[PDB]
Write an enzyme that holds these catalytic residues in place. Structure first.
Site, PDB file in Angstrom:
ATOM      1  CB  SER A  12      -1.018   0.024   1.108  1.00 41.70           C
ATOM      2  OG  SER A  12      -0.454   0.049   2.396  1.00 41.70           O
ATOM      3  CB  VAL A  94       9.879   0.835  12.626  1.00 41.08           C
ATOM      4  CG1 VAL A  94       8.724  -0.029  12.122  1.00 41.08           C
ATOM      5  CG2 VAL A  94       9.797   2.219  11.958  1.00 41.08           C
ATOM      6  CG  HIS A  98      14.297  -2.247  10.959  1.00 40.93           C
ATOM      7  ND1 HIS A  98      13.441  -2.166  12.050  1.00 40.93           N
ATOM      8  CD2 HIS A  98      15.079  -1.145  11.024  1.00 40.93           C
ATOM      9  CE1 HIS A  98      13.687  -1.034  12.691  1.00 40.93           C
ATOM     10  NE2 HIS A  98      14.663  -0.358  12.082  1.00 40.93           N
TER      11      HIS A  98
END
Ligand code: K
Lengths: 112, 103
Positions: A12, A94, A98
């Site tokens: 998205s 976040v 990662h």
């Protein structure tokens, strides 16, 4: 619950995707800290490395192998740095695991 | 600064974990494989389980060392990465706020 990475995973939010397979996604950082700066993320939403478990061993090794092959693809032959941040003192932005991959300039020491 | 045997925080048949005698944070340790992989860019598919084991050892040792408020894991490759020794090392830093960018 979902972090902004959920939009990168579900496509998205357009991202510059360097590699994808069923286990992981690699994309360019939009706030880059080096001339080459990409992120390797699992599709499994492990929030942080401190919350990985034994069942994740294979996946964690896969993320490191994908990081180094993408680094080769991005022309980081003269060197690069892999960074994983955990929690507030790590500066984790976040809460989805990662691996940062930084290259294309000299990286300094200390690493923050 | 000469290390002491207690600077080995963890050992198994796969890896060693040892304090950095030139620490960059109040807690700073190093996770190395016993297999001689010179740099992460030279790891291969056969190293997948080892690499995951090193990361799990890093995170369990960070718990043991009291890094619950957060920490950073760093792997340097080559001259631009500031790699100091041509053997694979995972640096673990904690006990202070780490900055951004990470060098
Ligand atoms: K190093």
């Amino acid at each position: 619950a979902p972090t902004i990475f959920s939009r990168i995973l579900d496509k998205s939010l357009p991202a510059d995707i360097l590699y994808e397979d069923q286990q992981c996604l690699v994309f360019r950082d939009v706030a880059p800290q080096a001339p080459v700066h990409f992120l390797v993320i699992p599709k499994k939403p492990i929030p942080r490395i401190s919350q990985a478990e034994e069942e994740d061993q294979q996946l964690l090794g896969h993320l490191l192998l994908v990081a180094k092959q993408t680094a080769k693809a991005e022309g980081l032959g003269d060197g690069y740095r892999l960074v994983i941040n955990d929690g507030k003192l790590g500066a984790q932005s976040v809460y989805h695991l990662h691996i940062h991959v930084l290259g294309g300039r000299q990286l300094q020491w200390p690493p923050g």
